[PDB]
Symmetry: D3
Subunit: 206 residues, 6 copies
Amino acid sequence: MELRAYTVLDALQPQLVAFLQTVSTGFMPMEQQASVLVEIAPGIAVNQLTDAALKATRCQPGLQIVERAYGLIEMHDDDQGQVRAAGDAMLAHLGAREADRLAPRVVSSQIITGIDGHQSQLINRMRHGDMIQAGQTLYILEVHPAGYAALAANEAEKAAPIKLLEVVTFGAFGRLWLGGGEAEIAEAARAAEGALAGLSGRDNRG
Amino acid sequence: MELRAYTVLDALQPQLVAFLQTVSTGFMPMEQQASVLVEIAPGIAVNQLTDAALKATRCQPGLQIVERAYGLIEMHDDDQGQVRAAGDAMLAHLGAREADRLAPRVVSSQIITGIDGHQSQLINRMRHGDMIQAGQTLYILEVHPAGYAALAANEAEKAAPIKLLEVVTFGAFGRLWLGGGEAEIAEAARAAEGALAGLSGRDNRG
Amino acid sequence: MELRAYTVLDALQPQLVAFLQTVSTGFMPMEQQASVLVEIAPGIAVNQLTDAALKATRCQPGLQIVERAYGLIEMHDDDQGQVRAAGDAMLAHLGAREADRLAPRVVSSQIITGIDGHQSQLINRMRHGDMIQAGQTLYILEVHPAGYAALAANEAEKAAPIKLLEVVTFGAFGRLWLGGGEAEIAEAARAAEGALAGLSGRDNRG
Amino acid sequence: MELRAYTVLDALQPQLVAFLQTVSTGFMPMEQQASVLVEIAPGIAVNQLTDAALKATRCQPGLQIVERAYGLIEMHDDDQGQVRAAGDAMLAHLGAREADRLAPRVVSSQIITGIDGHQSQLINRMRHGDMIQAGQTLYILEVHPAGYAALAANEAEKAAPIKLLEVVTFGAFGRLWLGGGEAEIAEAARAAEGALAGLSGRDNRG
Amino acid sequence: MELRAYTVLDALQPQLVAFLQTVSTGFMPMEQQASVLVEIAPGIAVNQLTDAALKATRCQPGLQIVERAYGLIEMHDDDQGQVRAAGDAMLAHLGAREADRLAPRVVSSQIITGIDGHQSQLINRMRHGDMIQAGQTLYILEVHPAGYAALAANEAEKAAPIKLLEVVTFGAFGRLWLGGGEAEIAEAARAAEGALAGLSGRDNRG
Amino acid sequence: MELRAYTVLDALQPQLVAFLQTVSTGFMPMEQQASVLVEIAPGIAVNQLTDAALKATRCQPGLQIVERAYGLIEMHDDDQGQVRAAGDAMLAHLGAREADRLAPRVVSSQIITGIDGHQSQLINRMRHGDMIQAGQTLYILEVHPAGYAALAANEAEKAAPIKLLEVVTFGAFGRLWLGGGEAEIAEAARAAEGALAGLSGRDNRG
């Protein structure tokens, strides 16, 4: 098993919670809960980590995804101590440490101001979070590995009042779409990429 | 055969446009366009109305729904005069005047303040518009016939800064879910209900 | 309890077979097979009919639908005699004769020539059969009860080279959409309507 | 306005829990939790009941369904007393006592032994619970109103080792499909029907 | 950003239009409009191209896809001058020229005559375009990169009267399924592969 | 064309049949039929194999999948002689022999005893076969190439009374989830991996 991504979110922000409540297949997170996300290869082996975390802690799983190649587990609890114990149990099962994850790589990042009404339509049709209106500012981010998109979303939301349009935290690449005012989006993007730049991990230049 | 609902929306507001862009099966509406919605029985006969409107005007259809019993067509254009011409062409084909529609009946209307986070989750999972967060105020409206829900949504959005969560404008009953601050929701609800109460039509008692 | 619709189709035509192969949940029909369709209330009791037919004949079920109120079973075989035997076994279990079905009621029937390209789009998005192009002729039919729509489709296809766009043979109402040239559609519509008008049954007024 | 169905399930059995975990849109139930289900008209007004229950108790909602006409809410908790308190809060908001519900009506009930492999296929394609194999015994039940189907499922599972194939507890009618051995299904069916026949309520004739 | 595919379609043919009207998520194309398709890596960055094209021209976007790795944008207009200006704006944003695209590679190509009725069933179940019947001829094509499948479909349709069954113009590989008569399919395949062979671009031998 | 996987299943076991009846897009298999599965690259070329098998034998196709990169065909018949003739026809078309397939590789394999109720929920939500309950034992297997998962499932089911929860026999990797008692799962896993270890084929160490 290879550790691809590992992140602890100290407190889930309300828009990310509402988004996860929309798309998650397990037990629903609630506002301000702590969360840990672990992405590994091979995919189906993530079930071993879920079992390790559940037998060790009272965390509940919100997301478990076995996709084309990779596997992702998200677990949450009111108490950060429980979420960190769950992460510890999963890392122990892997024989790994936190820094054995891949360092996040920003593949693509752009702020698009004054979006055309035809492009807001395309985003609205695709997204599962909030809607966007013509003339607002759009932030798009693509990251590798995918598991770091949730951290980027949560840190964006902490930093400025923006709208979470879509976050995809599994796949070959992770993706984030935000909408809002120009100044607010610039601050949110600053915070999201700053959070990713500060993480330890294996070289991942692609 | 029967005209159930007829409404002209003078200018589509941005959240209702974003919602319609998400759920519509035809040609996408844009902000501030005019729109006309016509609901009839029997369902498949709405195709006759669509043909009449398209041959007479430049309007484009956003929604055509043939559901269990009823049929709904929505047409839009930049020009209110084109939209009223489309509506008039459809009324003419049906053999009706606007006042032969059913008068809207408010089946249920309620404001729920300070929603619990578990109910926020339920709404987020169901809706196709914006998301709602714990502690916000929810407005819920059920109307008969269903085709009046869009007018209610548009007039609510004009009146106050609220979030459009979900609007269902076809079926046995039409339904509207809005979210936001308490004072804003109270104003939006007054505007929605006032719009429905001012419409002429045939007596439509439960 | 009630026999709503009963039809034996002597030979399934190729476009109707291709459509049924697209939407059916059971065992796929093939070209020129015979078929029997039975619609009853209450819905779940159609399972009793299916069991009776399967224990008595070699027929295979293509469709079994238990919808809001009603239940539909379609069975097919290379041999018309097996299919009539299956239908007879189902009628016997129900306690009925063929003529205890509801006589078909044409709710609406219309030919629309020279369809606008915007209406072609609406039909293409909705349908599960062939596509339609701008300027072609559309036939739309609504029948009650719904289970007679398949007979209408099959007889239409026998009579003229048309395109089967959509046929809905369960629900509160049955619906048929055909496309093609004007003369061809006129002949297909005559054949569909004539097939329904020739069927015995209980008076079924609106 | 109307109370249609009201049931308290003292302890959710493991197959019904696994089924609800598959289809529910809210917070997942767990084995042996208590549950209360309330079905009303009009549909959207179920949101008022959900709010009343959440503000009064610790119960969590598993299902909230606003369908064509009706609304259903299911709430659960480890403690039967919390669940009865939630039900009482909802009855109070509605203005009702438990006995103002509609008495359950068995629309259809049948055991089909030795199912044909073609019918096993049809059931497997439709269901969301366990699978059924050729030659097993099938129990089918249709009840009115729909909200009583869950009680029937839970009591069936308590009484005998059977397989829960499908339970539909909202709509115009509620439906239950069970599979297993002949003697086991006979005992489960007796328990389901006995549970429904023992409930007080308003006369509910067809 | 890497330019993978670039194609200008001078006039969209009616079956391809009907297909795109079925599957597209944006603004619907119409018969005989011009279209430009651009496929790039990384996926989410296609939003930058969409914005560039929309701010420069009056083209409307029919398809915007962000898939596992790649991104695709399609834009159309009545006037080829607008579509070519949109392509120019997108290429300018990329710092690229048309010949910086990958040359198309035919991965697999086959004509299958007299298809068996069991194989026409499989195709009918999968496809989103027209249906196929037993005994007709099938053309299957797989191309790399995927973005060239639309050009192949449009040129096929120009060349001979065939049926467009399915075209997949994004992914790791693009795919095309056509049905019809043997002579017509042979001509359509000739035209489709001839169009791909004539395009400039980077060596792409795989 | 490259032969990736080739397996003949002498007799399909009842749970695998019920699963295939749930997910298959072609002609439904029945209990104890023989089956052959062939996986190749490139994807769309699997249509050539389907045509070869159908023109040579009376087998019927249950599954035909053209996924991101690969193609899979499954064909079945009551008589193993017909299924082996179909496999022979497909291998002859490829110019291949059975041992030209990739040898199966077990990527990941684990037995998880006493599963937590939160993890049984996650499995129940994901799966298409039988349900799993809290405290049961889970077997998870990931294999490469994907086409060998069906053989593993069938051999597991022969070996011990277990529950087939999910089997994914196409993709980059094949996956199998089983549930049941600890001793039964250990025997089923033994049989599944033993079957894969005994197959000839090209070196496939990954």
